[PDB]
């Protein structure tokens, strides 16, 4: 089972199992046994763009945790704090998308 994604060199060490990180949080969970492997290489000459690749997104502030090998792709309405935000209130939205 092969998967692909693009992350910074900072988060590369987070793909190790049994640890908490920016990637290993609600955003992405991986099996801790991890019979497979991980292959990565630098691609700053292709993915990077002089105009600024702001089209790459990641959901950090997802409400609930994640189970290994689970897809997290949805609208992801942000409802936190001691009040119903309803997605329209405005403040405390801090949307997970970045």
């Amino acid at each position: 089972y092969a998967d692909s994604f693009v992350i910074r060199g900072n988060e590369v060490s987070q793909i190790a199992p049994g640890q908490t990180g920016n990637i290993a949080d609600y955003n992405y969970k991986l099996p801790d046994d991890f019979t497979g492997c991980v292959i990565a290489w630098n691609s700053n000459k292709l993915d990077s763009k002089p105009s600024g690749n702001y089209n790459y997104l990641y959901r950090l502030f997802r409400k609930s945790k994640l189970k290994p090998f689970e897809r997290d792709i949805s609208t992801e309405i942000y409802q936190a704090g001691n009040k119903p935000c309803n997605g329209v209130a405005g403040p405390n939205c801090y949307s997970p998308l970045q």
Binding site: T20, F61, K65, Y94
Partner: protein, 49 residues
């Protein structure tokens, strides 16, 4: 807050506390939790924190 040369140690006791007020802060980076799993810091009574 103070630098690493002089920490501010506090004794929390006699109160009842939960884990929501700690979750008031979003930019959590060093969320490493030892001894106790973060998802179950509730419903268990310490002796002095």
């Amino acid at each position: 807050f103070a630098s690493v040369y002089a920490w501010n140690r506090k004794r929390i006791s006699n109160c009842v506390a939960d884990y929501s007020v700690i979750y008031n802060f979003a930019p959590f980076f060093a969320f490493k939790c030892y001894g106790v799993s973060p998802t179950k810091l509730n419903d268990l009574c310490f002796t002095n924190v």
